[PDB]
Structure formats: C-alpha cells, structure tokens
Amino acid sequence: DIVMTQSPDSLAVSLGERATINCKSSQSVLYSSNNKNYLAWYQQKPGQPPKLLMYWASTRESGVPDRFSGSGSGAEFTLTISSLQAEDVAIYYCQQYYSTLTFGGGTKVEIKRT
Amino acid sequence: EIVLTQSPGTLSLSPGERATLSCRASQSVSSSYLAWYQQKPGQAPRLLIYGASSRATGIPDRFSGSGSGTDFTLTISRLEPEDFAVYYCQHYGSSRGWTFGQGTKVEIK
Amino acid sequence: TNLCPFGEVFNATRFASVYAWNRKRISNCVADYSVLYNSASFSTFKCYGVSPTKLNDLCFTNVYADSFVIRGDEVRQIAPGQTGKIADYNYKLPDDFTGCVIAWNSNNLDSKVGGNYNYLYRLFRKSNLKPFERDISTEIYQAGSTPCNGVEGFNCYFPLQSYGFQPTNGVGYQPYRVVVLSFELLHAPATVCG
Amino acid sequence: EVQLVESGGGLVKPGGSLRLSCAASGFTFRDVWMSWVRQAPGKGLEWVGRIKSKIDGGTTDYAAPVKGRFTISRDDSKNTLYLQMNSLKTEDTAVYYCTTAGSYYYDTVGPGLPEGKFDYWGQGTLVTVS
Amino acid sequence: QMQLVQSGPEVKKPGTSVKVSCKASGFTFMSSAVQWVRQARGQRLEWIGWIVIGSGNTNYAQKFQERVTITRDMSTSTAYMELSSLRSEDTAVYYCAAPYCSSISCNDGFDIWGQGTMVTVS
Ligand SMILES: *[C@@H]1O[C@H](CO)[C@@H](O)[C@H](O)[C@H]1NC(C)=O
C-alpha cells in the first residue's frame, strides 16, 4: 500500500494568519501521462464526515473559499490557506488516487489563544 | 534543488595563456545535462559547451568541456581577447532543476 | 438474420482513447444504417464511400467500427488526405478509404467538472502513422542527438497528452464520440446486409 | 439534496461477524465506484476497500490490514452497498463510512452533478468490538 | 538563421503584474521548448521556469511557485510569461531561450537566446 505522511501533526494559528500544511508520499503520485498529480485534500470537523476541498490540489471545488490553494508536484506537496478564519478550524487530510485509496494521518488546525 | 558552485570566482590571466574554469554540484547526476554559457556585458548568454563536451555550432577548437560525476570543468587552450567574459554552468536534470552556478569571471592581466 | 448490435458501438458507456482507438468487427448480421442516419442525433454523418442512403442497398463481406473520442475541431481530421496531430499520429484513413465517419456530441457524458483527463491522444511519434495503424507504445519520445535515458526532462517526453475536457468548453473544444465505419469487399460471399 | 443512509452498527463480540449497509441517494448508484472508509476515535482516516461500477469487472480490492476478513458487495436492484466483516478484532473498532470519494476520476459520470460536486459521504455508523 | 525576439522594456509598480513575450522565428516551434531566465545587473543568472511547446507542460523554481505562469500560443509562434506580486527586488533583465529545431531533431542545449527584456519595479 502507498503511504502518505503529513507534517506538522498540528499547528496553532492566530485569526487572519496565513498557514500551511506539508506532506510527503512514499512515492510520486505523478502519472507522467496527463502531467497530473493525483493528490486531494479533505477537511473534517468533529462529529462530521470529511469533505473534499481540492481534487488535484491545483483546483478548488465548488463552495470552497478562494483562500485555499495547493502547491508542489511529484512526491511532495503543500496546502496553503492565505488567511485562516474561525470557520476553517478542522482536521485536514491528504488523499492519494495513484493506487487504490490512501489517507495520511492528518493535521490539526486550531486557533491560537492564551 | 541541486546547488551548483564555481571556482575560482575570479581569474586574472594574460592573453595567450591557458585557462581553466571549474564547477561542483552538491550531488552528481549526469554529464548529459550539463552546459556552459558565455556572457559579455550588454549581451545575452551564449552556449559554448553542451553534453559536458560537445561544441556548439561555430565554437573554436580551443574550447572544450571536461570532468565527470560531481566535478566538471571548462577549459581554453589559449586565451583570445574575445574569451574574456563571465561564464556560467547549468544543470537541466530531470527538470525541477535547471539551476545555475554562481558564475565566474576572467579578467585581463 | 440477427440484427447487428450497433448499440454496443454507438451506445457504449466508455470509449477508447484515440491513441489506442478501439476496433470491432461487424459480421454475419443485418445492418441498419438508416436508423442512424435518420436519428438526427449525430452532428456529422459524412461518407467518403457510397452516399449515406445509397449504401443501404449494398451488401459487404464485413464492416469495421473504429471508436474514439476527439475535440470537435479535430473531427475534420478524420478523413482521407488529411494532416494534423490526429491524422498523423493517432488515427489515419487511407486515400482509398471507403465508408463513413459519424460524430456525436458527448459533452454531456465525457466531460468532467474538474476536467476529464482519461481521454488521451498521441503528441509525439518518430514518424507518421500508416493507415489504420494503432500505436500504443508508452516509450519516452526522444529528440536530438543525445540518446534518451528513459527519463523525462529535456528532449525526453512522454508521447501522450490528455484532453482537458470540461463542460464549459466551447464547441470546438467539446468532446465528440467518433465512429468510423469501414467497409470491405473481400473475395467471399457478403455477410453483412440491410 | 443528496443523502446517504447508514445502518447495521453496534456492539460485536471479538471473533464474531457483522453486516453493514448503506442506502444510495438520488445520484446514479450503479455507475459510481464506491468505497468504505473507517475512523477509530482519536485516529486518522483509513481506507477499507473499494468496489467498481457495473461497466467494469465489478471487482473489489481491500487495504492490506483488512484483506481476507472483509467482503464488499452491492445490490443494484436495491441500490444498496454492503460490507461483511468476519473474525472481528478489537483493532477494527471504528466509525464506518460509505463514500463516493475518489470515484469521479475513474467513473463514467459526466459533468451533470446534482449538487455541483461528486464528493458524497454518509454520516457513518459506529462498530464496537469488545 | 534562428532568432528569438522579445517584447520591449516596461516599468511597473510593486504589487502589480508584468507580462513578457518571446516570438519564435527560423526553426520548428512545436518540437522546441522555451526556458525563462532572469538576471539583475551584476548578478548571477537565475532560472525562473520552462515550457515544452508541444505539450504546454511547465515547471517552476520553488522561489517562483504560484508567482509565475508560463504559457504559449503556437498560432502566434510565441512564448509568454507572467510574473505577479512584483517587488523592487524583481528588477532584472528577463530572457527567453530555446534549442534550434530542425524538422528531424533539436539541439541538446540552449543555443539561442533573445535580446532580453528590461523590467523595472518601483
Ligand atoms: C441507444 O439506445 C437508445 C435507447 O432508447 C436507442 O433509442 C438508440 O437508438 C440507441 N442508439 C443506437 C442503437 O445507435
């Protein structure tokens, strides 16, 4: 099975602050043909199922704020949120479509406070 | 990204003297992706050597690439006034590369 | 006198990528092309062989169906005497071709919101295709004097490119399902009639 | 709107067996690849297995940790997805979900998505082994 | 004789975007690939990104990730590049380059460079 890993395990972010999530695959998800990276990002809140934000990590799905954008290629990628809002607090997951389905361990994004 | 470095950063030679330029990769990849370029002030860079050894069309015989693995060189058998220039190396790789070295300059002494 | 299973060709749920276009033999059955011609479902129904309705009175030893998906602007390339990326590297008809080319607008089926990248076409080849040649090699295309090491980067490229099929595409960029019906008269009794 | 309904969860004794099921929504079920995903409390998402649409071989595949103990099938006349689990372990305790996730790239579904999206998940059901 | 011709000089404000064109002539464009490099005066060459003309495929240096987009239009036989979120540090001469391509094969290095385009941010 292909294994995705993520870092940091969690990140405290103040409101309005830019934040990123890194990840690395055990192998490239690039298919050569089509020049596409088969990586998606999902958002999950407690008590709820995860939902898709980006399918190739290059494009947003409908209803997704423009603040969200993916980046990178091959085995290594980063998700960027241009500015975090309270509504965006969630556990974020990578998903691979290169073979079968794989999920990463996920990353927690929370609001920084004293 | 692979880092390329060059040495000496500056050389001072008289015309008619032999000159050697060198570079070092942070890691070896292949000679097939190496090329050297010449630049004069006010002008675009021009290809001298590709494949780490093949001459570009119109290049004089005095120019030749050499070296292997991590360490590659560019040599001039004897300097002409035309040869005093800033030189750069580039590594094409498998893409996600194409980095340039710090550059080197040959001054007239 | 079984009816020919045209639905297996024209109603197919999936179509092959044009670089690896599908081929199926039609034989030993009763054909009806008038149902296709009069369906008015097709954006194009053009014959380079016997005219679309005159052919209904003729029997053939066989008919072949070549199935693939291309852009609407590329449909014109599916003809004898043509050039361009599809005509030379993906699918080619001979100058002596006899038969018909049928196009259908699949924008409601083959397009995907994020783009459908499952439909591939060949971008590079060492030379032009022979008529009805099917080149499915995935070997990295070489350019220049330096031998390719099998790794993409410079003067080494994967031979295939995807279509960006999306619902918002203009008609020329919308996908069309194309079926080419090739007809043959072999030195044999006819097996296909209507 | 699109809504999946999940059932069949509950407490199971170790070494026992359980049948889970999920009802299809208004989107065409038969043409969409389906998969099962599970999440233990305090843990990240884990893929369980997948079943292909009728146009394909209809074959299935499973994550290595669950392979040979899990079986996936569907009833097209009822448009219902099923998972059978055998020889359950305490390790298998999780909330199980039915989803369309990852299918859009490989399925035959066109642009005409009923909500503008292809990504659908159930609320899932809890399975406990103890 | 192959040549590349670039668009002329332009001055931009910080926070704005700039576009630079590079027109092909004298060689087969479709078999070629175009590289973009910039150089501040007195500084070493810096790679920005490159495009394969036949496929439209691109790659970028991490420094320019999502700041630079490279496109081409074969009907105009021209490569295009755009740079966004301009800073005063982005002042440089920008160059396009490509290998010579015959109908049969291409050169294995960037033998032809354009005259360069001056871009100033202030
Ligand atoms: C495809 O199936 C429909 C079913 O109603 C039929 O009307 C149509 O003629 C078929 N197309 C063929 C057989 O080419």
How far out from the chain centre does Cα D80 lie?
10
Q: Using alpha carbons, list the distances in angstroms from residue E15 to A68, E84, E86, E87.
A: 20, 7, 5, 7
Half-sphere exposure of E88 (CA within 13 A, CB side): 1
- Nearest CB among D44, D105, D119 relative to A97 is that of D105
Q: Residue D121, Cβ neighbours under 10 Å: how many?
A: 20
Q: Is the CB of C13 under 6 A from ligand 1?
A: no
**Six token digits for residue E102:** 């015959």
Which run of H or of E encompasses C88? helix C85-89
Which atom of ligand 1 is found nearest the CA of C10? 14
Name subunits touching B (3+ CB pairs < 8 A). Answer: C, E
E50 in reach of chain B (CB within 8 A):
yes
Tokens 């599970």, residue located: D38
Burial label, C73 (beta-carbon count in 10 A; 0-12, 13-18, 19+) = middle
Paired with B99 in beta bridges are B91
- Domains of chain E (ranges plus CATH)? 3-107 (2.60.40.10)
Nearest to residue D47, comparing CAs of D31, D57, D34, D62? D62
Radius of gyration for chain A, computed over Cα atoms and rounded to the nearest angstrom:
14
Nearest to residue C122, comparing CAs of C161, C72, C173, C65? C161
Amino acid identity at E4 = L
Please give the DSSP secondary-structure letter assigned to residue D27.
S
Distance CA E40, CA E61 (A): 17
The resolution in Å comes to: 4.2
Name the pairing type of β-strands A102-103 and A90-96.
antiparallel
Distance CA D59, CA D70 (A): 14
How far out from the chain centre does Cα C148 lie?
31
Distance CA C126, CA A52 (A): 42
Which atom of ligand 1 is found nearest the CA of C9? 14
**Domain extents for chain C?**
7-193
Tokens 């093949």, residue located: B54
Q: Using alpha carbons, list the distances in angstroms from residue A63 to A46, A68, A86, D30, E119.
A: 20, 11, 17, 27, 38
Closest CA in chain B for residue E110: B47
Tokens 């160059």, residue located: E95
CB E93 within 8 A of CB E38: yes
Q: Which residues of C touch E107 (CB under 8 A)?
A: 144
Residue C54 sits at φ, ψ, to 5 deg, of -70, -30
Distance CA E8, CA E120 (A): 12
**Cis status, amide bond into A8, omega within 30 of 0:** yes
**Six token digits for residue C35:** 């149902």
Distance CA B94, CA B97 (A): 7
Backbone dihedral region for residue C96 (phi beyond 0: left; psi -120 to 50: alpha; all else: beta): alpha
Amino acid identity at C28 = N
Which atom of ligand 1 is found nearest the CA of C11? 1
Distance CA A50, CA A68 (A): 16
For every residue of C10-41, DSSP letters joined together read HS-S---BGGG-EEEEE-SEE---HHHHTT--
Amino acid identity at B78 = R
Q: Which residues contact D4 (CB under 8 A, 6 or more apart)?
A: D22, D23, D24, D25, D98, D120, D121, D122, D123
Which atom of ligand 1 is found nearest the CA of C39? 9
CA of D27 to the centre of ligand 1 (A): 22
Residue A35 sits at φ, ψ, to 5 deg, of 55, 40
Nearest to residue C37, comparing CAs of C48, C52, C58, C26? C52
CB E92 within 8 A of CB E119: yes
For every residue of B35-51, DSSP letters joined together read EEEEE-TTS--EEEEET
Q: Is the CB of C37 under 6 A from ligand 1?
A: no
Residue A61 sits at φ, ψ, to 5 deg, of -80, 160
Name the pairing type of β-strands E58-60 and E46-52.
antiparallel
CA of C55 to the centre of ligand 1 (A): 21
Distance CA E97, CA A44 (A): 46
Please give the DSSP secondary-structure letter assigned to residue E46.
E
Burial D80-97, CB ≥16 within 10 A → b, else e: bbbbebeebeeebbbbbb
Burial C148-160, CB ≥16 within 10 A → b, else e: beeebbbbbbbbb
Distance CA A77, CA A56 (A): 11
Q: Is the CB of C145 under 6 A from ligand 1?
A: no
E and D touch per CB criterion (3+ pairs under 8 A): no
Which run of H or of E encompasses C7? helix C7-10
CA of C170 to the centre of ligand 1 (A): 26
The answer to whether the CB atoms of A49 and D122 lie below 8 A apart is yes
How far out from the chain centre does Cα A27 lie?
17
Nearest to residue B6, comparing CAs of B29, B30, B32, B26? B26
Q: Which residues of B touch C152 (CB under 8 A)?
A: 94-95
Q: Whose C-alpha lies nearest to ligand 1, atom 13?
A: C7
Q: Which residues of B touch C146 (CB under 8 A)?
A: 32, 51
Residue C17 sits at φ, ψ, to 5 deg, of -60, 145
Which D residues in the span 21-80 are in contact with C, Cβ-Cβ below 8 Å? 31, 55
Tokens 């008529």, residue located: C131
Q: Is the CB of C42 under 6 A from ligand 1?
A: no
Q: Is the CB of C11 under 6 A from ligand 1?
A: yes
Q: Which residues contact C66 (CB under 8 A, 6 or more apart)?
A: C21, C22, C23, C91, C132, C179, C180, C182
Q: Residue B52, Cβ neighbours under 10 Å: how many?
A: 20
Nearest 5°: the CA angle A45, A47, A50 is 45
Residue B26 sits at φ, ψ, to 5 deg, of -65, -25
Nearest to residue E34, comparing CAs of E9, E5, E14? E5
- Nearest CB among D47, D50, D116 relative to A62 is that of D116
Name subunits touching D (3+ CB pairs < 8 A). Answer: A, C
How far out from the chain centre does Cα E17 lie?
15
Q: Which residues contact C40 (CB under 8 A, 6 or more apart)?
A: none
Does residue C97 sit in helix, strand or coil? coil
- Nearest CB among E54, E105, E108 relative to C123 is that of E54
For every residue of C108-155, DSSP letters joined together read TTT--TT-B---EEE---SSPPPTT------PPEE-SSSPP-S--SSS
Residue B56 sits at φ, ψ, to 5 deg, of -70, 155
CB B3 within 8 A of CB B91: no
Q: Residue C32, Cβ neighbours under 10 Å: how many?
A: 13
**Six token digits for residue B99:** 């980095």
For every residue of B47-87, DSSP letters joined together read EEEETTTEEPTT--TTEEEEEETTEEEEEESS--GGG-SEE
CB E55 within 8 A of CB A35: yes
Burial label, D29 (beta-carbon count in 10 A; 0-12, 13-18, 19+) = buried
**Six token digits for residue C110:** 């083959």
CATH topology of domain B4-108: Immunoglobulin-like (2.60.40)
CA of C39 to the centre of ligand 1 (A): 9
Nearest-neighbour CA in chain C from E102: distance (Å): 9
A35 in reach of chain C (CB within 8 A):
yes
**Domain extents for chain B?**
4-108
CB C75 within 8 A of CB C176: yes
Residue B62 sits at φ, ψ, to 5 deg, of -65, -20
What are the DSSP E strand ranges found in chain E?
Answer: 3-6, 10-12, 18-25, 33-39, 46-52, 58-60, 68-73, 78-83, 92-98, 112-113, 117-121
Tokens 């300059």, residue located: B105
CA of D103 to the centre of ligand 1 (A): 27
Distance CA C164, CA C171 (A): 13
**Six token digits for residue E40:** 């501040």
CA of C7 to the centre of ligand 1 (A): 6
Distance CA B93, CA B70 (A): 13
**Six token digits for residue D85:** 């689990």
CATH topology of domain C7-193: Alpha-Beta Plaits (3.30.70)
Does residue C87 sit in helix, strand or coil? helix
Nearest-neighbour CA in chain A from E1: distance (Å): 33
Distance CA C83, CA C85 (A): 7
Which A residues in the span 81-110 are in contact with D, Cβ-Cβ below 8 Å? 91, 93, 95, 97, 100-106
The answer to whether the CB atoms of B51 and C146 lie below 8 A apart is yes
Q: Could you tell me the CATH superfamily of domain A4-111?
A: Immunoglobulins (2.60.40.10)
Distance CA C56, CA C32 (A): 7
